[PDB]
Write a protein that binds this ligand. Structure first.
Ligand SMILES: Nc1ncnc2c1ncn2[C@@H]1O[C@H](CSCC[C@H](N)C(=O)O)[C@@H](O)[C@H]1O
Ligand SMILES: Nc1ncnc2c1ncn2[C@@H]1O[C@H](CSCC[C@H](N)C(=O)O)[C@@H](O)[C@H]1O
Ligand SMILES: [Zn+2]
Ligand SMILES: [Zn+2]
Ligand SMILES: [Zn+2]
Ligand SMILES: [Zn+2]
Ligand SMILES: [Zn+2]
Ligand SMILES: [Zn+2]
Lengths: 418, 10, 191, 417, 10, 187
């Protein structure tokens, strides 16, 4: 609580608010705060990168919208809006006792929402979407005002066990549609059961035409990760990007094109393609060439209990931002194990062959443990009568749930909430 | 307005 | 026929992006390119590997985009699909922004190098079935240029072409020369 | 609401409270209400049999303690007590507005609990444990709510720990749960599912009287030995005295060992289960050795399987009728995964493929079998045991809602969470 | 004290 | 020795429940039963199948409970375990309620009819290992709480062959001797 005298002097017309870091009250002002009037120090910018788009299980932000910290926050009443403001921020920039006034005000609107921008010395910036845009670092979409937001429409190619849908749910993003291409019966099954019939399954991605894309109604989000076997370089039998299942990449490339808005249509649109980092060099280049972008590399280890390094091409907001670990996450294989079993390593390795000690004997990971490694809710793939082999394979191919949670989170600022 | 308490970090 | 016919004095010289094969020759033969030897109106690229959309944009407007698989035998540094995908990719870069009513044509030609799975892929990616045009006794054509079917001929079952392929000896191919004819509706004649 | 006018005449000293059915106000008085002063009609007794020992997920009674009905009830504040009284009962027998006054009384005690025994026209019977006992037909009287303690359990041939699961679901505090088992998969299920709490011993044949004694007093001994060599439809059956049939006798031993001496009147309960499809001399010999006759209970009444089983034991009210609470899943369809469709309405296990899925004839999925047997979904998703092994484990187990039915009145003898 | 509402019966 | 010795004039005649074999005369021989022919002091049952605890209670107090498996070959209507379990059951019916200090003895005898598993079961159910007492000139098992039975090589192989050879029984008579400490002698 170190800025009270500085802000006092700010309203005393002796210090410029733009000359102070309104987050921590540092004098080391370098940037301007993208959302409000004032300066920002670099450390708070780092924090802002890790924290801004972190949301709790209630679907509200984990921390204050201003300081990206704060001990007690006020959640926002307006529909589809998820912001919070710590009591402490408010009891400075707005006025003293303004916080309890919002606490007691049953229908309350946050300052990102309220019609006018003055709320004390605190004022909302008019160009803030673009500043936000730059902060996280070309056609770029501004964030949709809270009342206009609608349910997201999703095309998901090579959907696997429907990780996409799961994460969007966990984030509490309202989902209008979720069309998914898949051909593996076990995975389709998992999806069907787990999301209660909601997924429109089409078959082979190669049966999806532009006409289909058009009549399956506008999409807000296209996602997918093609098979990696013929791409992965450690495979002696590789057929490469242009053969085997490698060429399925190009189907993504096709359908993305088909699903994309025409120039002049500025509706928000997002896409995410994933694959293994262990590919050829010309392969990775040709993918980058075709999606006209370069991948970000993300390793699950940062946030899960597996060494899983993956490339992600796409235009999701802030996907370059640093990966943070929410407390829910389970780092260390031990956190993922069943009682009486003990972890050799701290991270499992999938892109000792028996990672577990159980009563002097050397055991493999149990499907439920593997689920836990991968960030999935436990028993998520307990659905049909498919072999243990099959359930392993399914979990083997999938996205790390907390990595995807990280990628999808800022979509909340563009779509509707439950 | 509704109120919650944050989860402390690191 | 999808475009309005241009009055003749208003017509302008065709601009062509020519991707693996080169049609400079037979396109000068028909009078589309001026016999005066410029680089001028036609670009020929070969290793598009590092061709970016900006490149295609700076090599000026294109009214025709052409691509083909290298004829049997000699020059397949890259696998036959690569030609189709790379073609497709650059094609979209050359496409007119919407809504420009300007006439825009493209053609991709297999010199009988694509197998059945590759053929299916081309047809799905180019959103049509190919026309097969034969010798006497050998080429496949995907295009938005009208009236390729302007003159009918022999059936030529896929088995035929298969054996025709098999021979592959003594180790091409402007059987496609006439197809560019309707382009005269929109573009300047020379000589 | 038929008794409001009758009670006026009851308090006007014009009608005997003992001459009216204080549950529904019927004049067809046959019995006396076991818990309170008044008469009881037969229909209400039937109701009382089905309903008294029905508890919700909050660990409180599902219906009123008096009328075994009621639309809105008051729960009881006192510790370990689970009773409810509908506002309506109270707004008659105690006094008018007494109910909302109890609603408003933040630390509140129910009339089975309250210091005095008289509470309006309503007064508690002194011999009520015995009347309760006879109503449901060496017998132990129900222990006062404050005095109750966590149950101590010996569970032989424990299987996948159904016993413990049901005791948890009923919200009975469990001091300890020693369990004999020999199958690694089942031990595992138990370990995982109950978070290490079960003290596993091995083979029942390693359990000595000394052991029984040092594993501290037991309040409840339960078990169902293997039925294969008992089952009459098994050509190779070896019968009660050979094969695994004789494992019955181990139960008979340990029960004896765990049992209190005469003169020790502490509550004690036991339950042994087996298949109804046994021989006749077999069933007789079991009855001889446990000195009792079995009750037969079929899961179908309350689950989605034809599962007929004998239950020997001394649990209160185990003759009483089975009720189906809303939670229960009658009909295989309620148990199936979406897009799958049930041929029959009940599964049958003591065509061969009970399911239609997209024109083809499929077997039950383990998760579906779980749903049939009353287990919470995925309960046997624990290790890397085969689908075969998980199926077999579910094959042997008790129907969870049948056991819930059997264990429920133990709540009136032990401590609550 | 506390109050609940009963589950209607079969 | 678990009971206080009774003075002789206070001593009373043994009451015996005898379950499959009959010990009427070796117990008469030893002076425990009077040769005068009463039913009196010994009850002998055979098919206990429908014997209830009330029966055992009404066949009066018992100071000794005896059981044995029928000897090899002929008379095994029931499987050899059945004898042990039925014995054990009626035994508990006959046991003194606690705490009655009264002397109470029991004995169960296998005439080499119980195999290894059946033996384990008996030893486990009767809470002790058996004493084996043998047949001697050129070349039976007993479980009991009666003192100094445990007071003759006999490898299990020996007994095995001894059993096998025997197509074609009281060595146990002396065991009852210490009962003279608590019970009346006759003649
Ligand atoms: N022709 C095709 N059309 C659509 N999906 C296909 C396909 N061929 C293979 N696939 C599927 O593509 C998937 C790629 S692995 C990616 C899995 C997914 N991200 C998850 O979270 O689980 C595999 O499940 C495979 O079954
Ligand atoms: N010697 C032994 N000691 C203890 N349990 C044994 C045993 N031999 C077999 N069993 C077990 O007895 C069980 C019989 S059926 C168990 C049913 C159990 N109520 C349940 O809910 O799952 C089997 O699990 C079997 O493994
Ligand atoms: Zn700062
Ligand atoms: Zn703040
Ligand atoms: Zn808001
Ligand atoms: Zn009544
Ligand atoms: Zn009532
Ligand atoms: Zn109470």
């Amino acid at each position: 609580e170190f800025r009270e005298r500085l802000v006092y002097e700010v309203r005393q017309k002796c210090r410029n608010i733009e000359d102070i870091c309104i987050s921590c009250g540092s004098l080391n002002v370098t940037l301007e705060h993208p959302l409000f009037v004032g300066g920002m120090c670099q450390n708070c910018k780092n924090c802002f990168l890790e924290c801004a788009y972190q949301y709790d299980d209630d679907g509200y932000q984990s921390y204050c919208t201003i300081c990206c910290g704060g001990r007690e926050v006020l959640m926002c009443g307006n529909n589809n809006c998820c912001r919070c403001f710590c009591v402490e921020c408010v009891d400075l920039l707005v006025g003293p006792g303004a916080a309890q006034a919002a606490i007691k005000e049953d229908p309350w609107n946050c300052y990102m929402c309220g019609h006018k921008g003055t709320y004390g010395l605190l004022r909302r910036r008019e160009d803030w979407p673009s500043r936000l845009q730059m902060f996280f670092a070309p056609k770029v979409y501004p964030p949709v005002p809270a009342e206009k937001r609608k349910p997201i429409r999703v095309l998901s190619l090579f959907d696997g066990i429907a990780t996409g849908l799961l994460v969007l749910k966990d984030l509490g993003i309202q989902v209008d549609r979720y069309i998914a291409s898949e051909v593996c019966e076990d995975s389709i099954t998992v999806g069907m059961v787990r999301h209660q019939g909601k997924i429109m399954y089409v078959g082979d991605v190669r049966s999806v035409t532009q006409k289909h894309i058009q009549e399956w109604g506008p999409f807000d989000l296209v996602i997918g990760g093609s098979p990696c076997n013929d791409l992965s370089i450690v495979n002696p039998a590789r057929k490469g990007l242009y053969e085997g299942t490698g060429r399925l990449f190009f189907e993504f490339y096709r359908l993305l094109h088909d699903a994309r808005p025409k120039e002049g249509d500025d509706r928000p649109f997002f896409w995410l393609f994933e694959n293994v980092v262990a590919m050829g060099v010309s392969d990775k280049r040709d993918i980058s060439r075709f999606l006209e972008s370069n991948p970000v590399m993300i390793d699950a280890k940062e946030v899960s209990a597996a060494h899983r390094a993956r490339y992600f091409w796409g235009n999701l907001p802030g996907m370059n931002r640093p990966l943070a670990s929410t407390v829910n996450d389970k780092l260390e294989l031990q956190e993922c194990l069943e009682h009486g079993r003990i972890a050799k390593f701290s991270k499992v390795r999938t892109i000792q062959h028996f990672p577990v000690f159980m009563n002097e004997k050397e055991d493999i990971l149990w499907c439920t443990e593997m689920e836990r490694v991968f960030g999935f809710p436990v028993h998520y793939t307990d659905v049909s009568n498919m072999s243990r082999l099959a359930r392993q394979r399914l979990l083997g191919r999938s996205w790390s749930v907390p990595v995807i949670r990280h990628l999808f989170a800022p979509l909340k600022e563009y779509f509707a909430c439950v | 307005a509704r109120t919650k308490q944050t989860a402390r970090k690191s | 026929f999808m475009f309005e016919t241009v009055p003749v004095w208003r017509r302008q010289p065709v601009r062509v992006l020519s991707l693996f094969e080169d049609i400079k020759k037979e396109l000068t033969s028909l009078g589309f390119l001026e016999s005066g030897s410029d680089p001028g109106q036609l670009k020929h690229v070969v290793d598009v590997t590092d061709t970016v959309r900006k490149d295609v944009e700076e090599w000026g407007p294109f009214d025709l985009v052409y691509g083909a698989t290298p004829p049997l035998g000699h020059t397949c540094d890259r696998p036959p699909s690569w030609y189709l995908f790379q073609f497709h990719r650059l094609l979209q870069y050359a496409r007119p922004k919407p809504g420009s009513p300007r006439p825009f044509f493209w053609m991709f030609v297999d010199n009988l190098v694509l197998n059945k799975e590759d053929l299916d892929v081309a047809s799905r990616f180019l959103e049509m079935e190919p026309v097969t045009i034969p010798d006497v006794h050998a080429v496949r054509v995907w295009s938005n240029i009208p009236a390729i079917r302007s003159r009918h001929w022999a059936l030529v079952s896929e088995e035929e072409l298969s054996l025709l392929a098999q021979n592959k000896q003594s180790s091409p191919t402007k059987l496609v020369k006439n197809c560019f004819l309707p382009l005269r509706e929109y573009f300047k004649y020379f000589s």
